[PDB]
A paper describes a structure:
The dehydratase (DH) domain within type 1 modular PKSs is responsible for the dehydration of specific C-3 hydroxyacyl-acyl carrier protein (ACP) intermediates, resulting in a corresponding enoyl-ACP. Here, we present the crystal structures of the borrelidin DH domain from module 3 (BorA DH M3) and the fluvirucin B1 DH domain from module 1 (FluA DH M1) at 1.80 Å and 2.01 Å, respectively. The DH monomers from both BorA DH M3 and FluA DH M1 possess the traditional double-hotdog fold with an invariant His/Asp catalytic dyad. Within each DH monomer, the substrate-binding cavity contains (1) a hydrophobic tunnel/phosphopantetheine (PPant)-binding region, (2) a catalytic region and (3) an acyl intermediate-binding region.
The fluvirucin B1 PKS utilizes amide-containing dipeptidyl intermediate 4, likely derived from l-aspartic acid and l-alanine. The second DH domain, isolated from the first module in fluvirucin B1 PKS, accepts an amide-containing polyketide intermediate. Unlike the BorA DH M3, all residues between α3 and β11 were modeled in the FluA DH M1. A closer inspection of the residues between α3 and β11 FluA DH M1 displayed partially higher B-factors. In silico docking of the alanine-protected dipeptide PPant intermediate 4 with the FluA DH M1 revealed key structural regions and residues that may play a role in substrate selection. On the surface of the DH domain, the conserved Arg 298 was in close proximity for potential electrostatic interactions with the phosphate group of 4. Within the catalytic region, the C-3 hydroxyl group of 4 is in proximity and oriented toward the catalytic Asp 231. The variable loop region between α3 and β11 (light blue) contained polar residues His 235 and Glu 244 within 4.0 Å from the terminal amino group of 4. On average, there is a 9.5-Å distance gap between the terminal amino moiety of 4 and the bottom of the substrate-binding cavity. The gap identified between these polar residues with 4, the high B-factors associated within the invariant loop and the lack of modeled residues for similar type I DH domains suggest this structural region may adopt a distinct conformational change upon binding to the native substrate.
Author numbering:
A (entry chain B): 25 to 47, 49 to 243, 245 to 300, 307 to 311
B (entry chain A): 25 to 312
The structure:
């Protein structure tokens, strides 16, 4: 009704607030973030530089898909980092094309501050074509997986270069079985309190990625290309994570809640680092 | 602001409240909403018992979107589909503006819908930044040689012809005729005068500026604005205006609008009206 009073459709999301139907046209969803209204934002980055997490673009792209009946995120490549400076407000736009005749829509995420030019930070494809989801869990912790000591894992990433403040220090337990890694990940109470409003809170899905850096440790490397991403259940505060390599050279991830019920499936996640590297 | 909290830009206008820049190489869309409850003058323009959004409202919408992209001049606008206002149901408005070409010209379109109906395009045209060199403010008012006209029965005549002009749209107060030219003074009712400052030009004021042109032709039948060319708004928020209408060689009318001190307000190079088919938008009258 805020949005409705402007002639648009209200969106009830912590980061997106209005939907603008274009008349073939497609659709645009808009929103505004900052470290005042999303304090967890200040806890993710590279050194002193803050970066909107890759998992936030996944959350945004899936939520736009929900609005057009295309919840499956078939593909998503991340292009430019979204540097957030201080408590500057950041305008967000998620642009969704009309459906092609193959059913697929293109999705894009743009952002800017002030009147500086918009920059495209994410681009991919949305569909309603769904893959059959991975079965639910049973035995936890999984049989034959050895418990790993992550007691000081966030310090190993603190001097490697990663910038994970308290909201993104989610990894609590991990195990290794062969090339598989298992993990328990949970939000702090502050982000836990907001979690119910998201598809999957961006800080929780990011921290679900942290245990993959246990099997093979490569400097700083961040999610880059996602493939076959489906959110299965919403509002999670704590999750279990099952990560495996693909023979495509990437990582599969199957996310469940504390009862083993599916939360999220990621068919493949490629990550990449980055003149001169850091140390 | 409201629009700011949604990640958009606010627009301060009575009918449009938000500007959404479309990054990519697309342009802009401005959005708003209207209803007889928030815009009571809507109820006072139509044909028969059918409330119709005034074509001048589309001129106002298109020009306001032009200002938002630094393209203030309405080079051309064609009205495509009438917009019926059904009771007090709200109407969603969208004004789409393209990226400028190499010419510096932008395409503009106005869409509307109520409830969950599909959008309908009501107006399409072209904005430019090119301004016309202004027309002379030469003032004896009224001009020499102009003969006063009794307009006391004018709106009663227009009613009998078929026009539906309620109180907010009965702004024609005085008129003079010289050759095939008409001069008019037009004033908003107090209710519309109070909100006129926020408009580029109140749609009810611009529409009544068109009422004096029928005094020469005395056309049988109802006709509504259809095509506009060279619409420049030179001064915003007028309540009372002077009007100078004359034909062009197109079968069209030009109009130059000044304020009550003779200063420029708006210029319309060409306006074409089109006859309304009996039985099109309201029922036909009953034969006698």
């Amino acid at each position: 009704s805020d949005a409705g009073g402007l002639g648009q459709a209200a969106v009830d999301h912590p980061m997106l607030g209005a939907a603008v139907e274009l008349p073939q046209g497609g659709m645009v969803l808009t929103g505004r973030i900052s470290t005042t209204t999303h304090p967890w934002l200040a806890d993710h980055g590279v050194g002193e530089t803050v970066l909107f997490p890759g998992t936030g673009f996944v959350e945004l792209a899936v939520r736009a898909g929900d609005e057009v009946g295309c919840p499956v995120l078939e593909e998503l490549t991340l292009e430019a980092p979204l540097v957030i400076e201080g408590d500057e407000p950041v305008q967000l736009q998620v642009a969704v094309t009309a459906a092609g005749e193959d059913g697929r829509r293109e999705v894009a995420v743009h952002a800017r501050t002030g009147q500086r030019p918009w920059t495209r930070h994410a681009a991919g494809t949305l569909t309603a074509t769904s893959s059959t989801p991975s079965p639910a869990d049973e035995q936890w912790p999984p049989a034959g997986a050895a418990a790993v000591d992550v007691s000081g894992h966030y310090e190993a990433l603190a001097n490697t270069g990663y910038g994970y403040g308290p909201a993104f220090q989610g990894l609590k337990r991990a195990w290794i079985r062969g090339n598989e890694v298992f993990a328990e990940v949970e939000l702090d109470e502050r982000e836990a309190a907001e979690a119910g409003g998201y598809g999957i809170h961006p800080a929780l899905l990011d921290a679900a990625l942290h245990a993959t850096g246990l099997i093979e440790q490569a400097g700083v490397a961040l999610p880059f290309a996602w493939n076959g991403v489906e959110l299965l259940a919403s509002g999670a505060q704590r999750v279990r994570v099952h990560a495996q390599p693909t023979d495509d050279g990437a990582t599969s991830l199957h996310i469940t809640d504390t009862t083993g019920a599916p939360v999220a499936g990621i068919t493949s996640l490629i990550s990449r680092p980055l003149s001169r590297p850091r140390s």
